[PDB]
Amino acid sequence: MAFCIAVIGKDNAPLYLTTSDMEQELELQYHVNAALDVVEEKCLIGKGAPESKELYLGLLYSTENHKIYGFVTNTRVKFIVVIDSSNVALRENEVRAIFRNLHLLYTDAICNPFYIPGESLTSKKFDRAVQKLMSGTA
Amino acid sequence: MTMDATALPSELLVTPQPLVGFCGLDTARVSVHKAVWEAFSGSLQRKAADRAAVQYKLLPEWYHPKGILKRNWMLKHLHVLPSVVVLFQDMEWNDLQWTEKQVQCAAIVQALKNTLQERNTRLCLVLLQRAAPLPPGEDLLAAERAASLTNACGITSKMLFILPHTEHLTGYALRLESAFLDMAQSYYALMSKRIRNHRDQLTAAHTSLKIRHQFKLGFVAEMRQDFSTGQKHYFQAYANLDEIRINDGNCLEIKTLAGFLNYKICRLMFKLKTPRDAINQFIIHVEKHKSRVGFKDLAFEHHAWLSTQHSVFAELFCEAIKNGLPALQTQHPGIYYHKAAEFVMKRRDAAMEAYAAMQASSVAEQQANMQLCDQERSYNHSAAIIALLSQAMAQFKIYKCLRFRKKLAIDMAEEYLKSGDHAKALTLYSLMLPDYRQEKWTTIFTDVLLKTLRCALLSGSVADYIACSVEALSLRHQSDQSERILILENLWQVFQGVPPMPKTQLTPEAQALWTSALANVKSVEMCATFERVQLSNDDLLQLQLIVRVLTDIPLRIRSFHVILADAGNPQSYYQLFCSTEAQQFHENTQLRIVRLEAHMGTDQVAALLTCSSN
């Protein structure tokens, strides 16, 4: 099992972290995972994904044993993780809760004014909170 | 016993249709038979609604199943053996030459009934009464000649048909088709009953013969349009296969049979438009298959066949598009196009593995298995990979999915790299790199950038090479500084035109290839600002253009250039003298340079980095 926690602005990948239930993803999957996430986000946005309500999208993409959830804020921000399986014991209400908390941390970092919007999530304090969310889910 | 249902692909890719035969007819008649065959090709002239499914073909323990026992029996049933036999003849109403017509048609129908006695098939005869039309109930010689037929053979009267004149022949051909639908379905039902009766008996519970029978049962049903019954008998055959043992030498053949079955049943799905049903069958069985084999799996098997699985399903995607379903393709234009593409990628990787295990010292016919590999060694061109990428490319482009198709394009170029075919890889990369810079995300931008470095050095499009290298030095801070230094040296080399340094990869042939180059080739960021424009024909502008280097490494501070413009009338931090404006030109002209073109280090940044004005 591995999760990749990713916030997405307009076109880039501000913060992606490739972690597992044990540690960061040792496998050299970094670039492939990032490219797949970006392509999926672009295609879905072109289709309709840009919408007012906080948009839930479970299994909107399906890679090799990694199933993706996309979420939309009315402030035009996107969020992604994957599960390292075609099938593994987990839930979706937990996904709702974890990305709600991901939004909470997003806006709490947006509180940091030194962070101009559209940048990498640099703060190791914020990022350790993010990997604590990771531990919450894996 | 348990023989294969079939080991034959490329079977019934189009909607299966019946076949009724036409005998060996000479050229002497083929001309008028042209009109005859025209009505026959009329089935292909007319709309599918008008078009009758059947088409034409030519010719000159328990007891074992007849008609089912072997797969060549299946295929011979499919097209070689017509359900019904029809021989077209001519009938001119005359006196004694018409008696010779009697004797001749008697001979031909005698031969034809002998042939039928070989193969148990229903028969019909068609005659052109080429004379002028007359009322029905007029020709007693029609009854006489039918009786001459019957004492010769016994064919029932109604099977006789007439097509006197072409303008009449067309309508009589339409009703011919209808009657043929009648007799064909009759024969099809009869064979269906034969199959079911066979299936009710077991030759000591062989249990796989019946599998063939239910397969052929589905064949019959799809002949007769009962798609649902036949598809479910197919799926029941799938269940029967499941009940069979696994992982034997057969299990691969089991998997291929299930591939046939998935093909057919998914056809029948999309014919009935049960999309996610087809998806579920697809997945269900394919992960069954992945489980069933752990090795051998020489991976041109169960991997290439996986690729063909997704190939057929892509075929059925486009089949749906022709049908018109937008569902899964609003979802995913081809869910499995590029998927099969990555499966043929693993195919080729497994081929590389095959070469590896070959590089070992490489009695149960493993050499034939090795010969298998040699056969598998043949399908290593992986150009078919490129073509499948092309189909996925276009298929996703169908709904205009630019990003995904572009990344499949970088896939293509990467593959050409693997094949060593730098040229077209460079072409697609040349398309992608401006795109990737437009995506503003430098990471994969730089990754394909070093890919392009390799591509261009191998090709020698050193103009393109240096363009990508220089926009790479623009923000190369994600990479090693020393390599930036090396590449900057390469920049001065190419500007001089002398061979570039990455000889660590270079080999003399392509080296000379690009030595040829640049004879034809003709042509980090800073900021442009203006202290004053739109003058009163008295002002004097000056160097407000701050030349900034964002590369850590310096570029040699060589020289400068300014280019004059004509609107209306013709007329770290490093700054050095240029006196760009001292020429007192005419008023109200804001001469904003297209590109900087000052000679710092070398000619320029060329790749499109210049700002407008203040």
CSV table of N, CA and C in Angstrom, one decimal, chain B residues 199 202 206-215 232-246 254 257-258 261:
chain,number,residue,atom,x,y,z
B,199,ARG,N,-25.8,-32.6,-27.0
B,199,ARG,CA,-25.3,-32.1,-25.7
B,199,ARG,C,-26.0,-32.9,-24.5
B,202,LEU,N,-23.4,-37.6,-23.1
B,202,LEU,CA,-22.0,-37.5,-22.9
B,202,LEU,C,-21.3,-38.8,-23.3
B,206,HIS,N,-17.1,-36.6,-21.0
B,206,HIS,CA,-15.9,-35.9,-21.5
B,206,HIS,C,-15.9,-34.5,-21.1
B,207,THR,N,-17.1,-33.9,-21.0
B,207,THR,CA,-17.4,-32.6,-20.4
B,207,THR,C,-16.8,-31.4,-21.2
B,208,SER,N,-16.0,-31.7,-22.2
B,208,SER,CA,-15.4,-30.6,-23.0
B,208,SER,C,-15.9,-30.6,-24.4
B,209,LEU,N,-16.3,-31.8,-24.9
B,209,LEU,CA,-17.0,-31.9,-26.1
B,209,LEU,C,-18.3,-31.0,-26.0
B,210,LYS,N,-19.0,-31.1,-24.9
B,210,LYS,CA,-20.2,-30.3,-24.7
B,210,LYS,C,-19.8,-28.8,-24.7
B,211,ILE,N,-18.6,-28.5,-24.3
B,211,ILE,CA,-18.2,-27.1,-24.3
B,211,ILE,C,-18.1,-26.7,-25.8
B,212,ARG,N,-17.5,-27.5,-26.6
B,212,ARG,CA,-17.6,-27.2,-28.1
B,212,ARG,C,-19.0,-27.1,-28.6
B,213,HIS,N,-19.9,-27.9,-28.1
B,213,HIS,CA,-21.3,-27.9,-28.5
B,213,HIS,C,-22.0,-26.6,-28.2
B,214,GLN,N,-21.8,-26.1,-26.9
B,214,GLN,CA,-22.4,-24.9,-26.6
B,214,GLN,C,-21.8,-23.7,-27.3
B,215,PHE,N,-20.5,-23.8,-27.6
B,215,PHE,CA,-19.9,-22.8,-28.4
B,215,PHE,C,-20.6,-22.7,-29.8
B,232,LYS,N,-25.2,-16.2,-23.7
B,232,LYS,CA,-25.2,-16.9,-22.4
B,232,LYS,C,-24.7,-18.3,-22.5
B,233,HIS,N,-25.0,-19.0,-23.6
B,233,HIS,CA,-24.4,-20.3,-23.7
B,233,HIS,C,-22.9,-20.2,-23.8
B,234,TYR,N,-22.4,-19.2,-24.5
B,234,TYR,CA,-20.9,-18.9,-24.5
B,234,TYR,C,-20.4,-18.7,-23.1
B,235,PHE,N,-21.1,-17.9,-22.3
B,235,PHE,CA,-20.7,-17.6,-20.9
B,235,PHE,C,-20.7,-18.9,-20.1
B,236,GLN,N,-21.7,-19.7,-20.3
B,236,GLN,CA,-21.8,-21.0,-19.6
B,236,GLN,C,-20.7,-21.9,-20.0
B,237,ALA,N,-20.2,-21.8,-21.3
B,237,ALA,CA,-19.0,-22.5,-21.7
B,237,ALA,C,-17.8,-22.0,-20.9
B,238,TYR,N,-17.8,-20.7,-20.7
B,238,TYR,CA,-16.7,-20.1,-19.9
B,238,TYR,C,-16.7,-20.7,-18.5
B,239,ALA,N,-17.9,-20.8,-17.9
B,239,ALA,CA,-18.1,-21.4,-16.6
B,239,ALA,C,-17.5,-22.9,-16.7
B,240,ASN,N,-17.9,-23.6,-17.7
B,240,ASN,CA,-17.4,-25.0,-17.9
B,240,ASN,C,-15.9,-25.0,-17.9
B,241,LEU,N,-15.3,-24.1,-18.7
B,241,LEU,CA,-13.8,-24.0,-18.7
B,241,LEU,C,-13.3,-23.8,-17.3
B,242,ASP,N,-14.0,-22.9,-16.5
B,242,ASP,CA,-13.6,-22.7,-15.2
B,242,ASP,C,-13.6,-24.0,-14.4
B,243,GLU,N,-14.6,-24.8,-14.6
B,243,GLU,CA,-14.6,-26.1,-13.9
B,243,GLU,C,-13.5,-27.0,-14.2
B,244,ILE,N,-12.9,-26.8,-15.5
B,244,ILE,CA,-11.8,-27.6,-15.9
B,244,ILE,C,-10.6,-27.3,-15.0
B,245,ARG,N,-9.7,-28.3,-15.0
B,245,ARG,CA,-8.4,-28.0,-14.3
B,245,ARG,C,-7.6,-26.9,-14.9
B,246,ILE,N,-6.7,-26.3,-14.1
B,246,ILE,CA,-5.9,-25.2,-14.6
B,246,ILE,C,-4.5,-25.6,-14.6
B,254,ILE,N,-6.7,-22.9,-22.6
B,254,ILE,CA,-7.9,-22.5,-21.9
B,254,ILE,C,-8.0,-21.0,-22.0
B,257,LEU,N,-9.0,-19.9,-25.5
B,257,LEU,CA,-10.4,-20.1,-25.7
B,257,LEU,C,-11.3,-19.1,-25.0
B,258,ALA,N,-11.0,-18.8,-23.7
B,258,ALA,CA,-11.7,-17.8,-23.0
B,258,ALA,C,-11.6,-16.4,-23.8
B,261,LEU,N,-14.1,-16.5,-26.4
B,261,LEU,CA,-15.4,-16.4,-25.8
B,261,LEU,C,-15.7,-15.0,-25.3
